[PDB]
RNA sequence: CGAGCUGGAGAUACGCUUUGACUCGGGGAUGUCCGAAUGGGGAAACCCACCUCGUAAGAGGUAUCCGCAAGGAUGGGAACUCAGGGAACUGAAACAUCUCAGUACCUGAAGGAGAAGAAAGAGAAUUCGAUUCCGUUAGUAGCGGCGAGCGAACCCGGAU
RNA sequence: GAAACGAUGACUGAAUCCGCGCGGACCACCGCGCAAGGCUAAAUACUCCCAGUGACCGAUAGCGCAUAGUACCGUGAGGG
RNA sequence: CCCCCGUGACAGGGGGCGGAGGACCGAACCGGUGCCUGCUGAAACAGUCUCGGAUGAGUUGUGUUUAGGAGUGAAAAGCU
RNA sequence: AACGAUAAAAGAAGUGAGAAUCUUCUUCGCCGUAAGGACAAGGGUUCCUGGGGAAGGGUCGUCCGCCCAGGGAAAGUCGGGACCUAAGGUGAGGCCGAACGGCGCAGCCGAUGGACAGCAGGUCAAGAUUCCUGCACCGAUCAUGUGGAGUGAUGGAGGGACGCAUUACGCUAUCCAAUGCCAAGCUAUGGCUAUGCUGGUUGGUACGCUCAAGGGCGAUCGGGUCAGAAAAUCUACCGGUCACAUGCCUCAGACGUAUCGGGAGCUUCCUCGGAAGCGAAGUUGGAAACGCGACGGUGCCAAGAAAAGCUUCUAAACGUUGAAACAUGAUUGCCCGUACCGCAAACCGACACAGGUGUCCGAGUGUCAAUGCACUAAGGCGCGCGAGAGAACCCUCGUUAAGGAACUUUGCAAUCUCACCCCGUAACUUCGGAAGAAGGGGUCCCCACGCUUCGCGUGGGGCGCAGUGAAUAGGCCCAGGCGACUGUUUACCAAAAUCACAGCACUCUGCCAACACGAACAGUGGACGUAUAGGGUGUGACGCCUGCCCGGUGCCGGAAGGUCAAGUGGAGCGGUGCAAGCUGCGAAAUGAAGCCCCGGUGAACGGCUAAGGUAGCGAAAUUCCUUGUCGGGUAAGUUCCGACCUGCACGAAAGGCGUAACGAUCUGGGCGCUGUCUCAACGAGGGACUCGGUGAAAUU
RNA sequence: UCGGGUUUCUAGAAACUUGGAUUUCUAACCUGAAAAAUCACUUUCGGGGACCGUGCUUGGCGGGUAGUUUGACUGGGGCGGUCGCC
């Protein structure tokens, strides 16, 4: 049904020319307003109304209704149901995703929608079904395993939502025929090999080759 | 001024003049609309509003920057002037230094001219005496892949 | 370059009175002048503009124009 | 999604029904394959016959944005 | 030479100095999803009327889109603006910048989107939802009366906000049929006399217990503060009570009544021809939208403007005796565009140019269907030199004896094929395809009968050489290379074996990310994305796969030691002076990133001494000798296929070997059928030749 | 804590110091949530914080770009040979 969002708009560059190569497809995707802080709410439950799939992301977002009679979208994690509910704030018991900080949080307690700076909403493991693993508590900072396979410090003043996401993992997704791309991306990359001395470093020759392996520009 | 005038254009018709026209000189009053343009909008000259006065018709104000305020300023001028920024072909019989050149052009500020100006100096006589210009000194002194080539100043005579 | 002085960007950063600057490395003696305040006629430049003059042209010359930046080309800047 | 059959693990196959698809043929439309014609042309790139795409990575309008060593480019140094 | 498309004319009459060409009439031909008609863009008066004939019009010209004067265009409701916002453009304060200047929230500007009140006809030579007529609707301001109480923000919320594909039912436009109905008269050539033939056969408004699909529907009390900044008698959320159906609300539209138009044609005059006035009928059945009922049904994923208008809630605020509202009249009604051309002699193309140009309407017959093909209505038009001749030669056509690819570089070219229906249909395979494989048969008319008819099937007869009897309308096959595939490219010599592609892999980036644009600790794109995400490179479905060498280059790491800048800092030497001092040069030490150096990585550069080619393929689009040798097909085969292998100079992601399917791809072969050829003939049309009119060019 | 210097009270003790590092803290500086979008402020504030970054200078890397260079003889040009002296 989708609802109460905004309108996006294709565009691949500013104050002039093409910056990030390619991309221009589209299909008028609107933007739904989310929430990655989940704090001015701290204290009330809400009925996960539904899990409306929404573009831009790839994370079956979830619809919530916090008692006040207000509305909000949430990165439906990995397992909430047709109307399961949830509260929020330190007085939160690490259940199916919650608006809880970090110290009060268990070890190796996979979560997500995590954060990088007190408030300033999420900013980590918010995609596909990325699972941020926790580890050691420290002074105030913690020890975490970001999807990357990295160990970064961060402190508890930075909320997070229980467990990982999923969106089933873009798996059986194979795209298919060129164009499933155009279904979004664009002019799928041009090989600087089949280009010209003129346009790219790899260019020239008379058959095929390599020599140096550099990127566009140098 | 003194007897024509009724714009080039010359064409028909009506007409104005010594009760002084016309032309000429010199101040006024009218002057829409656009354009710095400023009420607001805008594809220049077109659309649209508000306040104040007002019989209607109609009249004035409504940009911004400085400044209590009075008052000043935004734009425009052919070349000339000072500043900010600053090429290359070209020459070196090839080329990077150098040359062309601080030339071309851009930009800014102002004027009728500017800029520069009252020696913390020139310069060797214990001399001179603000700055600008011309003559000459001098193609010297000196700079220079010491190549190509570039090149002052005091002194002295004048403009003032 | 032995290279003074002026100049300014970054750093530092003195004296005020037998004080200070300079006189082309640097020191002495010698001499010259006094900075971190301002102002300033005149001669000099140019020529859109006016007058006068010319061993200047006199209509393929002279200004592009005996007038037109018009006609005409160009999306245009521009040319003409 | 509805039924039929089955039998060794088998899948499966059958009648219903539904309406998928850089699917099929073809006009518009969009291309431009081969031949001939044209070559001081009807035309500074075309005509006839012939041919490809045709719900798509489709075709197109208005508005607007991107530019010179720069843009743009399903990439020829192509177009600007 | 040419006179701008091979859509053809012909006569009569007229005008006039003068006519192949101007007007008129009557024949003819051409177009008819257009060569008809309506906007928009764009042009400007080309429009109309009266004149003209120099130049412009490829000849003429009495004519013109040309020359001249005059006229011609009319809106409260159509478009736009006085309303709205999108990309983008701007922009008080604010962020950056040698200058000029680049940014940038709000706000403002900005359609091609939203939003909003008129419909039927009439008519100047030339305009019409704009003028007239007929009735209507909209805001506004006013009065009259009803009402008798609130009204209700730059503010809240609701709402306006919308994708693609497919599709059920109702219908309207629109079209068709008929011994429906009205109108008019004639018919003869042999027949018919009317059951023939021709034309017309309704729109606006208003009322109607008529018919009616389809479409739209919760309400209300109360509660919870933590939500709408605030308030809220609204919204959001929570909970109790009655809602299958119905129940409502609503009608697309049909019918009837009435009224207003219009309506085949009819009457008189006509200054020569328009003008004026009159008026019949309105049937039954069938077809039928890409439009209307609408914000319908369903499925799908690649997930679908914003704002105001608008309903509602209140803060403020006014008054609660003359409100909000309703009705009835009264008054009001701004600016710009409104002619004509408009797929085209009136726009872009130097030209009255065979080109280009967005959207809408776009009839009938026949043909499964259609916006196709043939004819044709309406409507438009016969392309602005013309007339003879009937040679060569050239262009575009029709036929062709015997032969049938012998042509040739090659079957290039042109024939054959060609539609629907029934039968039938292989190798191979990713099981979907290959498949319209191949091959074969049928198709016309009539009568009867059976079927659901427009029509089809069963059967009997019929005519022709011939029955999609006209027009549209796949020739097929085997074998191989190259790329898997739809796609894309060299506007004006290359469409392909290019580019792209799904998929694979390397690699880098934790967020002010890498990366990129930029004068700029400005702004911004990546992304309102956060690692199953973003960049760069290379490889190119799927299949089995991906070998050996880190010496040299590049990268990541290690990281003792060697080397190395500025600077800190020290000996030391030296110049001048009487001295303090002032002063030239200065050195060991200490001082980074890298560089040396140690180690590693090949879907890194890359080689096959750092090492030597696993699988696989091999004379290959990479072979030189070479027409390799033998086998295949031919009578005969430099090329093609098969194998072998002595791989000049095959090789595993510049990927290797394969691969159903696909290809305006290239190579070889076969069947068919041909004028490609033996070898050309005849015939047509358009030039060429002749005469009259106008009259180039390169060149010299 | 490591560097040393200065001054005093006895190499130590004390103090004044002036440096490197580690760490730590934080008014500058930075940056994020809120009623008032970019910005200024109020503060919860939150966290970063002497780093980054901006300015001057140092040396490295730098076909990303720029300016350029790349001889002559030559029975044609390149390849080969050659170009001075006896
Ligand atoms: Mg003369
Ligand atoms: Mg002139
Ligand atoms: Mg066809
Ligand atoms: Mg903005
Ligand atoms: Mg003829
Ligand atoms: Mg004869
Ligand atoms: Mg075909
Ligand atoms: Mg291909
Ligand atoms: Mg293709
Ligand atoms: Mg270079
Ligand atoms: Mg060489």
Curated annotation (Swiss-Prot):
One of its GO terms (cellular component) is large ribosomal subunit. One of its GO terms (molecular function) is transferase activity. Keywords: Ribonucleoprotein, Ribosomal protein, RNA-binding, rRNA-binding. GO terms for biological process: cytoplasmic translation. Coiled coil: none annotated. The keyword Ribonucleoprotein applies. Transmembrane segments: none annotated. One of the primary rRNA binding proteins. Required for association of the 30S and 50S subunits to form the 70S ribosome, for tRNA binding and peptide bond formation. It has been suggested to have peptidyltransferase activity; this is somewhat controversial. Makes several contacts with the 16S rRNA in the 70S ribosome. Part of the 50S ribosomal subunit. Forms a bridge to the 30S subunit in the 70S ribosome. Belongs to the universal ribosomal protein uL2 family. This is Large ribosomal subunit protein uL2. It comes from Deinococcus radiodurans (strain ATCC 13939 / DSM 20539 / JCM 16871 / CCUG 27074 / LMG 4051 / NBRC 15346 / NCIMB 9279 / VKM B-1422 / R1). The chain holds residues 32 to 249 of 275 of the full protein.
